[PDB]
Amino acid sequence: AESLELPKAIQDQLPRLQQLLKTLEEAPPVELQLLHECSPSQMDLLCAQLQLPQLSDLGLLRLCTWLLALSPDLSLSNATVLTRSLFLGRILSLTSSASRLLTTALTSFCAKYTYPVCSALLDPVLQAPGTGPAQTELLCCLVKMESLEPDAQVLMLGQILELPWKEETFLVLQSLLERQVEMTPEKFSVLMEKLCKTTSMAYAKLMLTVMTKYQANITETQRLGLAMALEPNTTFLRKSLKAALKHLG
Amino acid sequence: DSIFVKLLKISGIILKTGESQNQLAVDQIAFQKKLFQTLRRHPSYPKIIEEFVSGLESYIEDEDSFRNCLLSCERLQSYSKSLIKLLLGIDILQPAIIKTLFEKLPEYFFENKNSDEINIPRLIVSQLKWLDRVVDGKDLTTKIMQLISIAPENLQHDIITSLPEILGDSQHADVGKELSDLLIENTSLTVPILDVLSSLRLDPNFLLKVRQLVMDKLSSIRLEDLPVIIKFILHSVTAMDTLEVISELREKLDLQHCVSSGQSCIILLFDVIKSAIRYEKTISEAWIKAIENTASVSEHKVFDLVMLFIIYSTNTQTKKYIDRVLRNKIRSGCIQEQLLQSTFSVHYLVLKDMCSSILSLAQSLLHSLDQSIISFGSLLYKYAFKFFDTYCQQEVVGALVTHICSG
Amino acid sequence: MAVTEASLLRQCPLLLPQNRSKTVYEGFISAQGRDFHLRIVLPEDLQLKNARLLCSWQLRTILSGYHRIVQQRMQHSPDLMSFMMELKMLLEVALKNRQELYALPPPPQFYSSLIEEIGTLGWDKLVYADTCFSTIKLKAEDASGREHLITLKLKAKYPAESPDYFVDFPVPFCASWTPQSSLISIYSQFLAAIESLKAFWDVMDEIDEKTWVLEPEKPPRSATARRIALGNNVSINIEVDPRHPTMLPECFFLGADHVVKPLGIKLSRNIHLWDPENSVLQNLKDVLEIDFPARAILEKSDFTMDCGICYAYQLDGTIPDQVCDNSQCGQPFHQICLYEWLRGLLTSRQSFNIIFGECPYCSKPITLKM
Amino acid sequence: LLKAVQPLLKVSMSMRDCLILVLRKAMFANQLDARKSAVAGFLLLLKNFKVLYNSVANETFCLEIMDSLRRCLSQQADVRLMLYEGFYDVLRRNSQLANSVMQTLLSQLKQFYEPKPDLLPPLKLEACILTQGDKISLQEPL
Ligand SMILES: [Zn+2]
Ligand SMILES: [Zn+2]
């Protein structure tokens, strides 16, 4: 409809790619090195042309393997588009917890291309309604990744900040800061600001974990906003929090 | 000066400051019934409990005093129980004591082996065990369920296993219910859950639900535990359900999906299965039935052959059954050769230590008609000589020569 | 933002226009807290198929390896926004690979507190410091007085992060790193890890001193498996639990099918008499019912203990272990030489993992198990 | 079986450790013979071993075992019978916990023995026999 013309070589190798994708249903060729030729919009068209979301899990895994094997790294925009077409449907389709295939393939694809990967994945999955526990557990395992490197954890956090925070956001963030990850003061400020606003029990866990660990970062006005959000008895662990809050003072 | 400390002092216990064990003046029952009848007859009769527990919590705000309250006591008349236990023997404070106990423990998530290398939370839960009398059994249940829903993983792993010391004989149904209602959510924690469910007093109809539940949640497990899960399943199975569960299993296990990236665990898995079908028989006949009646399936997976080899290697009464069935699927063309190719290209390591089975089979393959069968046996001999060791190779040559000269 | 009058700021706040028409951009680009100079001149239209782009010579040295990727992406990019995003991602991966170029410490945090912590540990535990102050080695003493050294690598700011610790002993050393943990904290942890396997060393030094110890020659502290000589051209080997060292370690003999034969027969009927309270050497002397040649000749060549095929000792560290089941020969051999010899031989018949054949010297039946 | 495999457990360590875990899980198991055999195995363990790693952990863990057993006394008659049958040999090896043993025995004793002279039934014998729906049985063979 847009009249996006894919590169002509890409249109002509289209059958070779489409047979290879079919074969992986059962090392990297240059058919994958051709993907350097595109602008990211052409990649977007091409993904729909190639029926990536129509793949099987195993094929997704083999392809992930090949794309990780790739020489000079995929561009940010391209890689994002890919990720969307690759996982996003299956993710948002999940009633229940993901197959290990999807799990591990995801982990690897993140582990290499973590920033574009999760910039593609996290935001929409959690902006989505009915974002069930299954998906939170995948994102929990994503942030539990030993391969999720320090600066990666910071960009994960930095990206989480801008969102509408709900129970799922807190549940994720709990596991995210179990790593004892570094926070700039402005970022801890935004954290405590959102954290001030509220009966949720995982949210209780969140407030507890910050108060316990990042007491090194906590000040009096943050402790006050804490007290304000802590006052509720709809909370559990009231006492424990009061003792932690005392200890901050 | 507190109501609390005064009552304990008159009831005949040395409130040691909390460096050494608190000493004891009287028998456990003597002190318990003493303080019991004391506050019973005492005026301000319902409020004095609130005063008692408020003074308690105010005392155990301190670390070491609390620690020593938790610790066992010392006799003077020669090693006893702890104050907390003696106190929780009393029911009229129990649910108070219970409540007070939980909502402080969260402080002690990220405390870890400071001074005496003894872990506070474990030591807390220790207090909760083998409770003769439990007024608050059900509320307790609901509270530990809050706790278990929230717990950090390790703590979780501990308390959960600790559970059956804690509970009794009456209240387990809803317990298990909540557990499965957790398991549907989370699958990293099955194994403890599963041990505990083996431990508790249950109906089996629930076990079945959970079994189906995990069978769905069976591709969606990490690599390592997998074997023990299957171990559970195969313990859990019976005379009759067996066929169906196996069918589901045979449908859900893949082994192209499991990639030091899958080897050790696969191995261990096979071992486990090996043990299972060693220490019972009917698993094998059912398993065979299952791959045998998988007839319409021209989409046969790797697993099947591997298990066939194995069963051929093990109990032998059925060997003629196995031959028969394998001839029949071959003539049907449902079994073919790129199958065998990828089979020996990966899972051979499993087979090295049963190579002799392969040959004893190939022997019965080449003595038949129907070229495709004979070609199969060939490939057998070929790969056997190919991947395995010298003795194998030797046995290959020696079997082929026999075929030549005699055949 | 979605619009590049604000997204250009949000993502390259350092990168800003000079020209009236937003065609001449200059400024900087951030990367790992490093602002690199940049001047970028577009055509009259906002097409990147032409986009003049000069840099620092710093930056051109750092992008030696990707100028073709630059030529690609300038022409393939839809927008300057995504172009520069991918550029910064690229810069980060470049320096990530070239991460050998990176260190600078803050003194008053580092060079102040570190010598206070040295005085805390003890200047006599201090065995070495590096000219960088990057590496430092320290000494711990077993209660016997065995020295266990350990190396530590210090970052720019040390207590913020774990230092990289490198230790000799075999078990995986775990150092519970908090920023409250200091040099003496990790030193006590080092001692606690030492005191767990202390009583292991108390048997190991005993064995080192007493008997004809063979083949962890100059055994380090890592060594949990040992080898001892006994009799003549018959050697035993041991592997001990550091946690239960006086407990029976798993062992076996190397040597002859008539010398190793009754040794195990005694062991089978005296292992029940293993009293783990004694020393291991003392337990052995009664369990095996023998004395050792306690360094009785140790390392002095009488041509007895020699391969007879390769005529060597310690062939690739391999010991003359395989021998003849014959009083007259007792010719000891390696594994590899005896294997290769009985390989070509015609009479050499092969079972599962056995080669039978004639001893080279005496032509008597000799068995080799691989 | 366990009497037979004993000597391996004498020498070995890790086998003893794993077997301990096994008996631990076996005690809670909803079968009866599970608890019976876990008891027997513990009895055999402690009878055959002074030590079962600081020796104070060995002693407090033996104490843990014996406390679990003290509560397993609450179980039916045959269990307690098995306990009694073992305890003599237990002490014949390991005298060090005579106090923890005899305290326990004497508590259970006093729970059926009355401390008054001139009360001609000095014990409590309806206490040792329980009936739930006219189905009657011994408990605690005195
Ligand atoms: Zn040699
Ligand atoms: Zn010879």
UniProtKB/Swiss-Prot annotation, chain A:
Give a Gene Ontology cellular component term annotated to this protein: chromosome
Q: Which portion of the entire protein is included?
A: 275 to 535 of 536
Keyword flag Nucleus: yes
Enumerate the UniProt keywords alphabetically: Disease variant, DNA damage, DNA repair, Fanconi anemia, Nucleus, Phosphoprotein, Ubl conjugation
Full protein name: Fanconi anemia group E protein
User: Coding gene?
Assistant: FANCE
Q: Which residues form the signal peptide?
A: none
Q: Which organism is it from?
A: Homo sapiens
Q: How is it modified after translation?
A: Phosphorylated. Phosphorylation by CHEK1 at Thr-65 and Ser-93 regulates its function in DNA cross-links repair.
Species classification: Eukaryota, Metazoa, Chordata, Craniata, Vertebrata
| Residue numbers bearing the Phosphothreonine modification | T65
Its annotated compartments are:
Nucleus
Curated annotation (Swiss-Prot), chain B:
Name its cellular compartments.
Answer: Nucleus
Give the region (Interaction with FANCE) as residue ranges.
1-239
Q: How is it modified after translation?
A: Deubiquitinated by USP1 as cells enter G2/M, or once DNA repair is completed. Monoubiquitination requires the joint intervention of the FANC core complex, including FANCA, FANCB, FANCC, FANCE, FANCF, FANCG, and FANCM, and proteins involved in cell cycle checkpoints and DNA repair, including RPA1, ATR, CHEK1 and BRCA1, and is mediated by FANCL/PHF9. Monoubiquitination prevents DNA release from the FANCI-FANCD2 complex. Phosphorylated in response to various genotoxic stresses by ATM and/or ATR. Phosphorylation on Ser-170 is required for S-phase checkpoint activation, but not for ubiquitination, foci formation, or DNA repair. In contrast, phosphorylation by ATR on other sites may be required for ubiquitination and foci formation.
Residue ranges, annotated region (Interaction with BRCA2): 196-282
Query: Where, per the database record, does this protein carry Phosphoserine?
Result: S170
Expression by tissue:
Highly expressed in germinal center cells of the spleen, tonsil, and reactive lymph nodes, and in the proliferating basal layer of squamous epithelium of tonsil, esophagus, oropharynx, larynx and cervix. Expressed in cytotrophoblastic cells of the placenta and exocrine cells of the pancreas (at protein level). Highly expressed in testis, where expression is restricted to maturing spermatocytes.
Family (UniProt): Belongs to the Fanconi anemia protein FANCD2 family.
Which illness does the annotation name?
Answer: Fanconi anemia complementation group D2: A disorder affecting all bone marrow elements and resulting in anemia, leukopenia and thrombopenia. It is associated with cardiac, renal and limb malformations, dermal pigmentary changes, and a predisposition to the development of malignancies. At the cellular level it is associated with hypersensitivity to DNA-damaging agents, chromosomal instability (increased chromosome breakage) and defective DNA repair.
UniProtKB/Swiss-Prot annotation, chain C:
The principal localisation class reads: cytoplasm
Gene3D superfamilies given in the database record: RWD domain-like (3.10.110.20), Ubiquitin Conjugating Enzyme (3.10.110.10), Zinc/RING finger domain, C3HC4 (zinc finger) (3.30.40.10)
* Zinc finger residue ranges, RING-type: 307-363
Question: Altering F252A: what's the impact?
Answer: Impairs interaction with FANCI and FANCD2
Entry-linked InterPro entries? Fancl (IPR026848), FANCL_C (IPR026850), FANCL_d2 (IPR043898), FANCL_d3 (IPR044037), FANCL_d3_sf (IPR043003), FancL_WD-rpt_cont_dom (IPR019162), UBQ-conjugating_enzyme/RWD (IPR016135), Znf_RING/FYVE/PHD (IPR013083)
Identify the stretch(es) annotated as UBC-RWD region (URD). 104-294
The entry marks the following residues as binding Zn(2+) 2, namely: C324, C329, C359, C362
Q: What Gene Ontology terms describe what this protein does at the molecular function level?
A: ubiquitin protein ligase activity; ubiquitin protein ligase binding; ubiquitin-protein transferase activity; zinc ion binding
UniProt-reported outcome of changing Y311A: Loss of interaction with UBE2T
- Compartments reported by the entry: Cytoplasm; Nucleus
A Gene Ontology annotation in the biological process aspect, one of them, is: gamete generation
Keyword field contains Membrane: no
Mutating C307A: what's the consequence? Abolishes ubiquitin ligase activity
Q: So where does Zn(2+) 1 get bound?
A: C307, C310, H334, C337
Q: What is its EC number?
A: 2.3.2.27
Modified positions (N-acetylalanine) in chain numbering = A2
Superkingdom, taxonomy of origin: Eukaryota
Note the CDD domains from the entry.
DRWD-C_FANCL, DRWD-N_FANCL, ELF_FANCL, RING-CH-C4HC3_FANCL
UniProt cross-references to Pfam families, sorted A to Z: FANCL_C (PF11793), FANCL_d1 (PF09765), FANCL_d2 (PF18890), FANCL_d3 (PF18891)
Q: Known post-translational modifications? A: The RING-type zinc finger domain is monoubiquitinated in the presence of UBE2T and UBE2W.
State the associated disorder. Fanconi anemia complementation group L: A disorder affecting all bone marrow elements and resulting in anemia, leukopenia and thrombopenia. It is associated with cardiac, renal and limb malformations, dermal pigmentary changes, and a predisposition to the development of malignancies. At the cellular level it is associated with hypersensitivity to DNA-damaging agents, chromosomal instability (increased chromosome breakage) and defective DNA repair.
What UniProt notes about the protein's domains is: The UBC-RWD region (URD) region mediates interaction with FANCI and FANCD2.
Q: What is this protein called?
A: E3 ubiquitin-protein ligase FANCL
What's the source species for this entry?
A: Homo sapiens (Human)
